[PDB]
Design a protein around this ligand. Structure first.
Ligand SMILES: CCCCCCCC/C=C\CCCCCCCC(=O)OC[C@H](O)CO
Ligand SMILES: CCCCCCCC/C=C\CCCCCCCC(=O)OC[C@H](O)CO
Ligand SMILES: CCCCCCCC/C=C\CCCCCCCC(=O)OC[C@H](O)CO
Ligand SMILES: CCCCCCCC/C=C\CCCCCCCC(=O)OC[C@H](O)CO
Ligand SMILES: CCCCCCCC/C=C\CCCCCCCC(=O)OC[C@H](O)CO
Ligand SMILES: CCCCCCCC/C=C\CCCCCCCC(=O)OC[C@H](O)CO
Ligand SMILES: CCCCCCCC/C=C\CCCCCCCC(=O)OC[C@H](O)CO
Ligand SMILES: CCCCCCCC/C=C\CCCCCCCC(=O)OC[C@H](O)CO
Ligand SMILES: CCCCCCCC/C=C\CCCCCCCC(=O)OC[C@H](O)CO
Ligand SMILES: CCCCCCCC/C=C\CCCCCCCC(=O)OC[C@H](O)CO
Ligand SMILES: CCCCCCCC/C=C\CCCCCCCC(=O)OC[C@H](O)CO
Ligand SMILES: CCCCCCCC/C=C\CCCCCCCC(=O)OC[C@H](O)CO
Ligand SMILES: CCCCCCCC/C=C\CCCCCCCC(=O)OC[C@H](O)CO
Ligand SMILES: CCCCCCCC/C=C\CCCCCCCC(=O)OC[C@H](O)CO
Ligand SMILES: *C/C=C(C)/C=C/C=C(C)/C=C/C1=C(C)CCCC1(C)C
Ligand SMILES: *C/C=C(C)/C=C/C=C(C)/C=C/C1=C(C)CCCC1(C)C
Lengths: 262, 264
């Protein structure tokens, strides 16, 4: 608990800069045609945005109400992640943002979603570290792999077939490395001997590592199925919105319960 | 116990819902709903999205029930679980099934009897919940729950009458909604007093945030209906505001009581 606030502030500045450049480099005629070919996309982003707004509301009430200083700090990090997600989705619904066209279908690659993911996923992993009192170097290395992972995802969408294949597969492979080590550090902390004691009970550490595996796995699955031609773009965008929301509010639902218990 | 009673209320809610959903399926015109969803392409997304939101809202209420700081906390978090669940499946239904609907006199826009059905099962139940929070007289709670139910039916009926009977039934509805909000505001007030016995299960500040939440959120429905019937917003813009309002009205109550549990 040494100003999560500072982490949240750095998050916001990186976001605004990226949002800045996405506005300045946008092609508005291009975005008009994307939203005209795909008429459900504004609704999806709009709806997701409102959802995270209310999600951020709930996290604020968890912060202002320190049942513990341990559980003040953890509710603070979720407030920023959910807020970042809120405004990124508002942006996607309302503004003309620069985007890539993918090699496989010529579908749009939303750099704002990838930007959100790169600011928030490594922060969610750092949050996993506080919950489990993990080694700071072990947390750092997964936060890094996660960031490289996501960039891999984005890059892979604009390469030809074989370099596309390799970068996606390497990405996917790092995602396994990440989920395994995340699973590990929650496990180290579930042990009866473990010092220092974790700020959450044994059961809640387990529900958290299960939540991350179930929710986060949907993104690689959507990307695989859409790139191959098995779902269309809009069906994938829907699953992504539900997944994004699920991944984040899932963590705030499980810690609301910890407060109620203690 | 009172937990058994909340369960029983929830069960009656589910049976009334299924019957109404039943008849809406049996009497649907599928060619009609295909044309409605073809003229208005955002409607499935709105209902779908709202549905997922209430599902997660119902998730949060379950964790509040299993984890009740006190038994009154269990009773109050239990009632919100059923209301949010009812809302969840009503919206899933609207997105996925062909449901019988009315065409309104003013625009020939669809009147979703499933939304009205949800409202009639849940709004009177939310008012009864306001009673437990404020330890109000049972007859005062009953009379607002009744007026609220008649109110909503008034809303629905008014959409399929000609101009002057339409006008009177809507205005009488609107008028009862004022009567309801005033008396709701009252019973929370009686309970905020320092002398009040028996002590309310929520602190003074939270009783105030609740009566403010209901007034802000619930007032959006009559406003959407007024503005759409007159031609100032189109149908889809109104449906969006309704979805956001419905969700807001309900999860607003669960956000404020999550805080009461945290406070000790
Ligand atoms: C360079 C210093 C200038 C000082 C001001 C700060 C802003 C700088 C940042 C981005 C400028 C974007 C310029 C790139 C070219 C225009 C992008 C654009 O208009 O998109 C049009 C579309 O692609 C076809 O019509
Ligand atoms: C928190 C509950 C879940 C979230 C809310 C569920 C209801 C969705 C309604 C509005 C979303 C925000 C407004 C977005 C409305 C659609 C945007 C729009 O209408 O765009 C024009 C269209 O793309 C041209 O064909
Ligand atoms: C639409 C409005 C509805 C409300 C939802 C907001 C929308 C999200 C906005 C920004 C993201 C960053 C928000 C970060 C919140 C951090 C909360 C916190 O920890 O604040 C501490 C204290 O109250 C003060 O110093
Ligand atoms: C690679 C990792 C993926 C994460 C993505 C988040 C960051 C995007 C921010 C800025 C790029 C904008 C600059 C684009 C310049 C456009 C070229 C152009 O049109 O000029 C001729
Ligand atoms: C905890 C459980 C974790 C398990 C994982 C959950 C499910 C992952 C779903 C899909 C991964 C697909 C990866 C397969 C390798 C990629 C094939 C491919 O990339 O297709 C070529 C295309 O050109 C683009 O480059
Ligand atoms: C398919 C790619 C699988 C990647 C394997 C990750 C394994 C991480 C576990 C232990 C490492 C011990 C140091
Ligand atoms: C095929 C690839 C799919 C990827 C699947 C990723 C999900 C990880 C699941 C299990 C890892 C099991 C081995 C990790 C061992 C550490 C955890 C442990 O021992 O559990 C804690 C114990 O209960 C406290 O006392
Ligand atoms: C309204 C028709 C009542 C006649 C049938 C007797 C059933 C009595 C039990 C529960 C109803 C109260 C529901 C309150 C909502 C919580
Ligand atoms: C919790 C917020 C939910 C956000 C998810 C929005 C998209 C989901 C829509 C499904 C029906 C779409 C059918 C056309
Ligand atoms: C998570 C997805 C939800 C999807 C939507 C489906 C409809 C849900 C309706 C009710 C939910 C459960 C209500 C919680 C039960 C509390 C009452 C209780 O269990 O106590 C009574 C006691 O057991 C006496 O026998
Ligand atoms: C306890 C309050 C319960 C009272 C409810 C009374 C219902 C009114 C009957 C309507 C007839 C039609 C019903 C089926 C058709 O223009
Ligand atoms: C047709 C099938 C039966 C479904 C009953 C409709 C229930 C409530 C809608 C409002 C009631 C007032 C209707 C005028
Ligand atoms: C469009 C035209 C419609 C007209 C406008 C809306 C009408 C307001 C409705 C109810 C107010 C309820 C009043 C407060 C509750 C009853 C007061 C009461 O009976 O108590 C005795 C008191 O001392 C004596 O004022
Ligand atoms: C579309 C427009 C919708 C119209 C919505 C109107 C809502 C009325 C709410 C409050 C009025 C307050 C005055 C009437 C009753 C006062 C009770 C009270 O405030 O009591 C608190 C205090 O503790 C005493 O000691
Ligand atoms: C808050 C948002 C979260 C947790 C988002 C998670 C995203 C992923 C784990 C994405 C994984 C991907 C791969 C492993 C390879 C293909 C591309 C990605 C980025 C979808
Ligand atoms: C859980 C959902 C809620 C709180 C729904 C509430 C609905 C209303 C308060 C509707 C009010 C109306 C009027 C006062 C006049 C016109 C008809 C209505 C039904 C739109």
């Amino acid at each position: 608990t040494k100003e999560v606030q500072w982490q949240g502030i750095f998050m916001i500045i990186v976001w605004l800069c990226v949002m800045g450049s996405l506005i300045f480099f946008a092609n508005p005629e291009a975005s008009r045609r994307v939203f005209a070919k795909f008429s459900h996309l504004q609704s999806f982003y709009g709806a997701t945005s409102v959802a995270f707004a209310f999600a951020t509301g709930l996290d604020i009430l968890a912060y202002v109400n320190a049942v513990s200083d341990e559980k003040r700090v953890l509710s603070g990090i979720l407030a920023y992640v959910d807020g970042v997600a809120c405004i990124s989705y508002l942006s996607m619904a309302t503004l003309n943002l620069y985007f890539l066209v993918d090699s496989t279908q010529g579908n749009p690659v939303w750099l704002m979603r990838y930007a959100e993911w790169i600011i928030t996923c490594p922060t969610l992993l750092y949050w996993c570290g506080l919950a489990s009192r993990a080694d700071r170097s072990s947390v750092s290395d997964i936060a890094t792999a996660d960031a490289l992972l996501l960039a891999g995802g984005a890059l892979s969408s604009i390469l030809p077939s074989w370099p596309a294949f390799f970068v996606f597969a390497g990405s996917f492979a790092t995602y396994i490395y990440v989920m395994l080590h995340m699973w590990g550090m929650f496990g180290k902390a579930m042990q009866p001997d473990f010092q220092p004691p974790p700020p959450l009970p044994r059961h809640a550490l387990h529900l958290l590592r299960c939540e991350i595996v179930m929710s986060w796995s949907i993104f690689p699955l959507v990307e695989f199925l859409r790139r191959q031609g098995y779902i269309d773009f809009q069906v994938g965008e829907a699953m992504n919105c539900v997944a994004d929301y699920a991944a984040k509010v899932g963590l705030a639902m499980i810690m609301v319960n910890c407060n109620l218990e203690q």
